[PDB]
Design an enzyme around this catalytic site. Structure first.
Site, PDB file in Angstrom:
ATOM      1  N   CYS A  98       0.829  -1.197   0.000  1.00 35.06           N
ATOM      2  CA  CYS A  98       0.000   0.000   0.000  1.00 35.06           C
ATOM      3  C   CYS A  98       0.855   1.236   0.000  1.00 35.06           C
ATOM      4  O   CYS A  98       0.620   2.140  -0.827  1.00 35.06           O
ATOM      5  CB  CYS A  98      -0.914   0.005   1.225  1.00 35.06           C
ATOM      6  SG  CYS A  98      -0.004   0.099   2.734  1.00 35.06           S
ATOM      7  N   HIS A 112       2.421   5.940  10.193  1.00 35.95           N
ATOM      8  CA  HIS A 112       1.563   4.812   9.872  1.00 35.95           C
ATOM      9  C   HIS A 112       0.605   4.526  11.019  1.00 35.95           C
ATOM     10  O   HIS A 112       0.921   4.744  12.190  1.00 35.95           O
ATOM     11  CB  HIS A 112       2.396   3.563   9.568  1.00 35.95           C
ATOM     12  CG  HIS A 112       1.693   2.561   8.711  1.00 35.95           C
ATOM     13  ND1 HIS A 112       1.012   2.909   7.566  1.00 35.95           N
ATOM     14  CD2 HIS A 112       1.560   1.220   8.835  1.00 35.95           C
ATOM     15  CE1 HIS A 112       0.491   1.825   7.020  1.00 35.95           C
ATOM     16  NE2 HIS A 112       0.810   0.786   7.771  1.00 35.95           N
TER      17      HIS A 112
END
Lengths: 334, 334, 334, 334
Positions: free
Chosen positions: A151, A178
């Site tokens: 991703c 993240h």
């Protein structure tokens, strides 16, 4: 003429791929394999989601099959991937999403089960890597088993491609803040391999190492050996932001960068690369299908040859949509 | 004449028991057994703690032994509990804290290893249960293997004992707002047995069932069949509060309840049951060694025969200190 | 023949009332008054929401008016409520949601502005209180200024009405685990009146006192003086659960309670009181329009005269929908 | 011969400065001024802290004075800073920490109150800026009113000074992942000036702009016009990390950078700049008095002229200790 898709593993990526496939309607899911989950548990897991909310439709279990919107799905519970009868269910493509079969030899165990092509929803050491909108025109019908990279890589690659095509990136370092994943643990815990990842996810930041920026040079061959970086894991539900600091060959003011990014987002990269100028935050990108959204106001430029760019990307979603789009393009090339 | 203590399992309870034993100095740790953790990892795990902070002392590894404050500790890595040479290390008592050996037959596997008595830091189906300050005078030197019940039980039992001795509890229902534990998981996840426990710990409340109030009737025989309840798991690091709603035989104003609780907290139950009147919150009870602290301002009384009481208790700590205190009392009775 | 509604104050309750009114379409918003917020800021605030996501529609600003779905809304910026020209905009009803005008005399300052009736979205000391589905049939066209009590009260009242009508509640104590609100503050902070509320909302539990269970006896006159309780404020985004421990006159097994609650939820209290039997958590009730949803599996019963019931309720939403439903019933009675 | 210190404002910075002054014992606090907080509230606020825990000592109120460890402190409640009788309490230095008097003219209102020198615990537009260990030798006894810049600046300046002295920084861009502050708000909220800062702190990341890297060039004149960056505000209690991406003139391997940073941390910058090689996380730096701690394992280097460095810094503490150290050096220069 939608292709028949089987899914191996009903984890977070498999459930979200099934959800995106049923929402978009580009492909059809005919088979799901998971050995540790029984049928009623899959009904409960697909029906309720803590992050993306309840499923918009009808899901139930009848005749030993998972019925979603009136569509029955055959369920397998085979641990060994070589024993799964993919050809009996009629599945043509197989999405490998368990995260333990990443090599070509391990992912080739679906081939004798009757599957034609295998798509790995993970970075791979030896399988070819394809990112939609960047290098997906290089695919051939000779490529049975391939990979969709990661991703993050899917967030970084279109923006880096646009900036390199317009201004010539010399070198760059990338930092990605993240959200929490399934591999992290609450109240600390054990983690032999990575000692930092075993600490408590709720109370910590936890720096980590990633190879997404190195995989960008695998996807784009001109940027090989020019990009590397690390990551931070903050306690966020499902939103992450990529920060890229880079040096350019040709002079570039920030307005020119904004203009070329908006122009690329409008025509060629519609639906992949997004553009915004509003005062947005992370939760504004929840359930967004874009691979990356450029934030104009967040970034800063030191000078015409030294800039810093900010992009928002949803970890759970987006990738699943890129997997579905890659399968649709693969079926179109057939 | 401190007793020699070995610890089976170096999880959260084992590390905190070792920390409390070295801080208080009542007992001596001579042996630690854990098969999945190597020595340098135990050094790193004991040195740094996300909740309770850094260890106040010196911890290192030398000659294949764990040296804490100049005290060497022998390390075992045996999976089978019957093969651990407890008598070779000189350990007299063994704290079983892995949570998988709770029956008397399973916890008796330490007996042929040279251990004299085994203390289980978990509720047990058949082993006798002892709570410090409530029924710890019932212990006999004939009891080799016993149990310290649970932390919640350790929070509820002294307050319930005081209220039952002063006013005669007829019946009661208990609700405990609990912090996150190691069994919960981030970003949802799987959980065959309990489907609610597999959901995401960061974003949810997650009701759960517990048997601590039923175990209070096991500890106090007069309250058998009068107490039951459930729990909520909110995303807190390490603080939980117990709420007990009860009906009494004799009339009792709230001031009389406060007076008898403060009087019991001062003399007989010093160090076990706490009392406060300040405007406190959960993080004010971090690293508190009390089993339970009565909150005077938080509770409310509907009438003289129907009241509701609030008590704060630290999940990680406190219990470990009660394990150490029980071992000290056991050594004193020898 | 939808009634014209003006909203005083564009805070969390006012924005959510406008959102619920535009989603349901029962009433029409023609005027919004807020002195501290300019027009583009209201466009940004209505467009993006961190909890409930992006607005499903078109919102913009043109000609000095707020256009939502093609409907223009006149904007006022008057601090003094007596100077607002409600009759110039044509608004018939006015929702007072600032939280500072709760008495009848203070909320009557909208009457000389041209407004006919004023509905207070807060508990009031002297205005009449109405809860939809419980006592909303007592309203008269002679009641210009009334109140919708509180959300908690709106959660507790239908369940308590059903249980009292079927089994005769003698007495009860209520505990509600509440999500964070706008009055709380991060990293501790100051709070003269309530010292506990000034502590850090992210790291604490923070017990608090509430008068919702006392207001239930105001709404239901037979339960006056029988219900009181407190609250806990855990760091949750927007989900709260009510726990009610009660004693009953007639014997009642848990299956009979479940049967009468499901029967009441199906017919008379459809859309107000919900019923479920699945293994749900808090985030499963995000953006739910029910006033309260009974959780069958979460509750426990000590005996036939002593039970404990669990209900889920959304703090942000639901109430706004009850405000809209009360205004629709008020317009129907005209 | 410790100097007498008065504190204006009892917020987070003032309380932590008082706590650090009483823990270190370098200076003496004789006066505290705050108009909105009464004496018992200051006792409660100084006694309990959600982040750093309970105060290690005795704090009470007697004779209208705040007694800490047997030391009485005179309390003022004057809103206008020109009316505070600093000379009556005997205070020589005054720490201005309210954050509203940052200019030289506004901070000079303490001069007619009897104070000799005023130290501003905030960045200032026109007052001179001093960072301990970087440019604190430039201070003169002619400087009555000065500034200690900001915490971030205090984190970035020694590491940047060491790297610039050893390898010649050409240009650099800085990103700092920041914990939540008192200016943020839960459940979204209003924020006219900065629209992003008004969103919910618990659920978002919230990019922000800062001028700490620009202030580094004010502190170090050779780096003027070479450093700029932005920030992210993640929901962390009190730990922030600075990430600096830079280009160097002389070639520098990562081992040489680690060697010169460790050598600088050992001798000259002892207690200011820290060095570590362990696998640490954010909560390992709770209540750490270092201005910045270099993380060797977290950083990455693209090549010998392009590197990225990671430093941990505590927001609440550290700065307070640098304020105390600057006041001690100022008293030593007298």
């Amino acid at each position: 003429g939608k292709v028949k898709v089987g899914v191996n593993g009903f984890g977070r990526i498999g459930r979200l791929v099934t959800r995106a496939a049923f929402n978009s309607g580009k492909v059809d899911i005919v088979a799901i394999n998971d050995p540790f989950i029984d049928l009623n548990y899959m009904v409960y897991m697909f029906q309720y989601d803590s992050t993306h909310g309840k499923f918009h439709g009808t899901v139930k279990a009848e005749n030993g099959k998972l019925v979603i919107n009136g569509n029955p799905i055959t369920i397998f519970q085979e641990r060994d991937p070589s024993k799964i009868k993919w050809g009996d269910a009629g599945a043509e493509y197989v999405v490998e999403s368990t995260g333990v079969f990443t090599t070509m030899e391990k992912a080739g165990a679906h081939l004798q089960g009757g599957a034609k092509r295998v798509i790995i929803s993970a970075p791979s050491a030896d399988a070819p890597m394809f990112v939609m909108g960047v290098n997906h025109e290089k695919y051939d019908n000779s490529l049975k088993i391939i990979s969709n990279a990661s991703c993050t890589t899917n967030c970084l690659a279109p923006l880096a491609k646009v900036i390199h095509d317009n201004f010539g990136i010399v070198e760059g370092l990338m930092t990605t803040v993240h959200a929490i994943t399934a591999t992290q643990k609450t109240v600390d815990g054990p983690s032999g391999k990575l000692w930092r990842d075993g600490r408590g996810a709720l109370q910590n930041i936890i720096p980590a190492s990633t190879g997404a920026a190195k995989a960008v040079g695998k996807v784009i061959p001109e940027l090989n050996g020019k990009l590397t970086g690390m990551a931070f894991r903050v306690p966020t539900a499902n939103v992450s932001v990529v920060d890229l600091t880079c040096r350019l060959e040709k002079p570039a003011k920030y307005d020119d960068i904004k203009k070329v990014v908006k122009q690329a987002s409008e025509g060629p990269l519609k639906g992949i690369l997004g553009y915004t100028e509003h005062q947005v935050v992370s939760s504004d990108f929840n359930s967004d299908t874009h691979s990356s959204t450029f934030d104009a106001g967040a970034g800063i430029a030191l000078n015409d040859h030294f800039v810093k760019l900010i992009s928002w990307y949803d970890n759970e979603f987006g990738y699943s949509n890129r997997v579905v789009d890659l399968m649709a393009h693969m079926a179109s090339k057939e």
